[PDB]
């Protein structure tokens, strides 16, 4: 349960579609997958036998990002109309819609605790929001440019995004601004509990984040400064994450590319021929072997993982 | 909402043929820039 | 009762998205359940 790293070729091509995908993400209790795209449309997959269960229309414009409650009954969706929809995992159908952002809105995430949504839009803004009736509660400034990903921590203290201001700023509800970039930050890896061992033998919580320089760099929040710098990548970063078991390191880019990297000695190991165009998305499944890629040529496709 | 979101997918078509639509501009303006060049070298040349 | 067609109301209806953060409580609101909750949200006054 730590050799998981996706072998070719691919086992499903989840080619039902007609727009191109910008995120995927696993139910943490079920054994199915959800999409976003640019159509307003969410659509529902069976990863375990390749088949399209559902879809989920509602929105008028670009999906941006999907996340999920932790226990899995929610899911929370923001588009490009402004919007934040909230959706059960029991009817399948809308139960609030969230207004309040001034434009695009690229990222979004539920709480830890399972009561309060989180979201960046291009506004420079960080909304939250109450589950129960739709609510805002705080905003957070500080950005001045696109605020691309939000990712919050294990505890639902800690916040982290990225924008376009060339800074990763952490929010407590500033804890710490690190602005040490060269081009614009896109996504952001929260470090789980199960990685602290490996990166002491190696070099919290720890926070890693891909870029459009090309590179990978992480930092740590309790002192602000870049342990490792990981860089290798052709393209443009769009999405990293951490391993299930916090040993590897998993990231995509715009050079179609897989590569898996670790803090042991940052360096290139295997590089996945995935999709014929850009790679927008990723994600790890907790405890099943597979990996599934979201990319920008509507296509879905899930790796096993040997 | 479907409606809505028609009409929203409808604009951005509209904001594409603008964008073909000057760049048709711009190709024409150098286009007749390179023959206007072409007709002063022959006339050149039968001057000369 | 008025209770009782209160209650299936809000149960069938929770599912619809009736949420309007910005609702003005009016000065008057004509109540024909008894024991509403005071102040009211868009949803209880949908279901009164």
């Known amino acids: 349960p730590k050799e998981w790293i996706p072998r070719p070729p691919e086992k499903y091509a989840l080619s039902g579609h007609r727009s191109p995908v910008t995120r995927v993400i696993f139910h943490p209790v079920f054994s199915v997958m959800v999409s976003a795209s640019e159509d307003a449309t969410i659509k529902v997959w069976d990863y375990e036998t390749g088949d399209f269960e559902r879809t989920l229309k509602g929105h008028t414009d670009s999906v941006q990002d999907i996340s999920f409650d932790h226990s ?51 506004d420079k803004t960080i909304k939250m929001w109450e589950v129960q009736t739709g609510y805002c509660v705080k905003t957070f400034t500080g950005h001045r440019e696109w605020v691309r990903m939000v990712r919050p921590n294990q505890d639902g203290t800690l916040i982290a995004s990225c924008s376009n201001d060339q800074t990763v700023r952490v929010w ?105 165009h850009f790679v927008t998305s990723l994600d790890f499944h907790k405890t099943a072997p597979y990996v599934v890629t979201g990319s920008v040529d509507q296509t879905v496709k899930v790796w096993e993982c040997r | 909402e479907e409606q809505q979101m028609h009409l929203n997918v409808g604009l951005r078509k509209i904001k594409e043929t603008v964008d073909q639509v000057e760049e048709l501009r711009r190709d024409l303006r150098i286009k007749s820039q390179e023959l206007e060049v072409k007709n002063a070298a022959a006339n050149d040349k039968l001057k000369k | 009762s008025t209770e009782a067609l209160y209650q299936v109301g809000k149960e069938f209806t929770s599912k619809m998205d009736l949420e309007k953060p910005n609702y003005i409580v009016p000065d008057y609101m004509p109540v024909v359940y008894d024991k509403l909750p005071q102040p009211p949200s868009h949803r209880e006054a949908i279901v009164n």
């Open chain 1, 72 to 122: 899995g009954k929610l899911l929370a969706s923001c588009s490009a109309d402004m919007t934040i929809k909230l959706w059960d995992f029991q009817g399948f159908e809308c139960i609030r819609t969230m207004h309040g952002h001034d434009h695009n809105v690229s990222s979004v995430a539920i709480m830890p605790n399972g009561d309060h949504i989180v979201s960046a839009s291009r």
């Open chain 1, 172 to 276: 407590v509800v500033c804890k710490a601004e690190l602005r040490e970039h060269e081009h614009v930050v896109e996504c952001i890896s929260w470090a789980p509990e199960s990685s602290y061992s490996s990166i002491s033998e190696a070099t919290g919580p720890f926070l890693l984040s891909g870029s459009r320089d090309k590179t990978i760099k992480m930092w740590d929040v309790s002192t602000g400064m870049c342990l490792m710098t990981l860089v290798g990548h052709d393209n443009w970063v769009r999405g990293v994450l951490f391993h299930s078991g916090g040993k590897f390191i998993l990231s995509c880019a715009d050079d179609k590319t897989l590569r898996v990297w670790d803090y042991k000695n940052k360096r290139c190991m295997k590089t996945l021929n995935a999709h014929e």
